[PDB]
C-alpha cells in the first residue's frame, strides 16, 4: 500500500529517472529498496505522517525517517523494529487535551481505549531510527512552556520518564536515589525472591 | 581511562601492561622512549625544541600544502603565471638545460606554518630531494621572501634525452605516470 501511494504522490521510479536528476532530489527507500526519487521531500513527509496518524494507508508500525543532510527518506515496514509510544506536539502545545483524558477516565461504558488515542492522532509509535529525527520533551508542562529559550520546536513528548525501566526495575522504590549498580543487582535479586 | 592529564602522553598501565611485560610481546601497544637532555639543551626550552625537531620524523607530506602536476612544453613559457619570475631568473643562466628539459612539471606548495614550525629550509628540502633521487629530479625553489613557497620538479633532463641511440620503445609509465609515482614516494618516504 505504501508503494502504491508513493506512486500516486509524484514519486518518479528509478527506471524512468534520468541519471542527472537524482543528484538534486531525495531518494525514497521502502524496506531498504530504493523505489525512486521525489523532487519535493517535505510535502511528501508531512503527507505520510498525516496518513499514519489517521491510520488510513500507512499502518501505525510503519516508520518514516527523513535524513535532511543526506537527502534520503527511509520507510520501514519491516518486522522486529522496537517502538515506544510518544505523545505528539503541534506548535508548542501537546495534542493530548482534557477531553481525551475525560473519555479515557470513563474507559468503562465509553469504549474509549488506547486504540482510540492512537487513531485520534494524540499518540504515535516511534522506533529508534525515527527517534534520531525527533525532538522530545521529558516532561510536557515544564519543557513545552515558554522559558529562557532552549528549544521551540519540540515534536514529541514523553508520556512518563519512569517507563524507561523494565518490569523488574519498576518494583524498585525511589530508583533515582540509588547507585546504578545497586539497581542492576536488585533487578537480579527480585527474580529470585519468594512469593 | 582513569590516568591523569599530567602524563600528556598515551600510557599503557594496569593489566594490559602486565600482560605485555609477562608475555614479552615484540610490539607493545604504546611503545615509548624517555629522552633526557645532556646539558644546556635541558636548561633552555629553545635548545630542547631543536632536539625535538631532530628526533621527530618529518615527511614532505606533513609540510606540503598541495601538489599539482602540470604539462609545460617550454620552461620559458611558464604556464603558471606565478612562477614566471623565478623560472626566468633560473633560466637566465640555465643549469642542466643542455641535456634537455622534461615537459611534465610537478609543482609543490609548502605550508609556511609547518615549514617554520619544524624550522625546515627550502634549500635544505631541495638538497634532500636532490640527494634522494640523485640527478633524476631537478628542483627549482623560490626565495623565502616570496609569499607562496613553491618547489618545481621535473623529470631528469638526461632521462628525458634517454642518452641512448636505440631509445627503447618500452616507454615505461611515459613521464606523467612516472611523475605521479615520484610524487607519492616523495610524500610518503622523504624523511626530511
Amino acid at each position: 500500500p505504501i508503494l502504491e501511494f508513493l506512486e500516486e504522490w509524484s514519486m518518479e521510479n528509478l527506471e524512468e529517472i534520468s541519471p542527472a536528476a537524482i543528484a538534486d532530489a531525495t531518494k525514497i527507500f521502502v524496506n531498504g529498496c530504493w523505489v525512486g526519487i521525489h523532487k519535493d521531500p517535505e510535502q511528501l513527509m508531512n503527507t505520510l505522517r498525516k496518513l499514519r496518524r489517521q491510520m488510513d494507508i500507512i499502518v501505525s508500525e510503519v516508520s518514516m525517517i527523513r535524513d535532511i543532510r543526506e537527502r534520503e527518506i527511509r520507510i520501514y515496514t519491516d518486522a522486529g523494529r522496537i517502538c515506544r509510544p510518544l505523545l505528539i506536539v503541534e506548535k508548542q502545545k501537546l495534542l493530548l487535551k482534557k477531553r481525551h483524558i475525560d473519555q479515557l477516565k470513563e474507559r468503562e461504558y465509553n469504549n474509549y481505549s488506547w486504540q482510540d488515542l492512537v487513531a485520534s492522532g494524540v499518540v504515535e509509535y516511534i522506533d529508534t531510527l525515527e527517534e534520531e529525527t525527533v525532538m522530545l520533551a521529558m516532561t510536557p508542562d515544564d519543557l513545552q512552556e515558554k522559558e529562557v529559550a532552549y528549544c521551540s520546536t519540540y515534536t514529541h513528548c514523553e508520556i512518563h520518564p519512569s517507563m524507561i525501566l523494565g518490569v523488574c526495575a519498576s518494583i524498585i522504590p525511589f530508583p533515582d536515589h540509588n547507585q546504578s549498580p545497586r539497581n542492576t543487582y536488585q533487578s537480579a535479586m527480585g527474580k529470585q525472591a519468594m512469593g | 581511562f582513569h590516568y591523569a592529564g599530567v602524563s600528556a602522553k598515551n600510557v599503557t598501565l594496569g593489566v594490559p601492561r602486565l600482560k605485555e611485560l609477562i608475555n614479552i610481546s615484540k610490539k607493545p601497544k604504546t611503545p615509548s622512549l624517555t629522552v633526557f637532555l645532556l646539558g644546556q639543551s635541558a636548561r633552555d626550552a629553545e635548545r630542547a625544541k631543536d632536539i625535538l625537531c631532530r628526533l621527530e620524523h618529518t615527511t614532505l607530506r606533513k609540510v606540503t600544502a598541495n601538489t599539482a602536476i602540470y604539462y609545460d612544453p617550454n620552461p620559458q613559457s611558464t604556464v603558471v603565471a606565478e612562477d614566471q619570475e623565478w623560472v626566468n631568473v633560473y633560466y637566465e643562466m640555465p643549469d642542466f638545460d643542455v641535456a634537455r628539459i622534461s615537459p611534465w612539471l610537478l609543482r609543490v606548495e609548502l605550508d609556511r606554518k609547518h615549514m617554520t614550525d619544524r624550522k625546515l629550509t627550502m634549500e635544505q628540502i631541495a638538497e634532500k630531494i636532490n640527494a634522494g633521487f640523485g640527478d633524476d629530479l631537478n628542483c627549482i625553489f623560490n626565495d623565502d621572501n616570496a609569499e607562496k613557497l613553491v618547489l618545481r620538479i621535473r623529470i631528469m633532463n638526461s632521462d628525458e634525452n634517454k642518452m641512448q641511440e636505440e631509445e627503447e620503445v618500452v616507454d615505461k609509465m611515459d613521464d606523467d605516470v612516472f611523475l605521479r609515482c615520484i610524487e607519492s614516494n616523495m610524500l610518503t618516504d622523504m624523511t626530511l
Binding site: 547507585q179 546504578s180 | 581511562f1 582513569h2 590516568y3 591523569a4 592529564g5
Partner: peptide, 8 residues
C-alpha cells in the same frame, strides 16, 4: 560515575 580521573 564521579569524573574523568576517578571512576566511571
Amino acid at each position: 560515575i564521579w569524573g574523568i580521573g576517578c571512576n566511571p
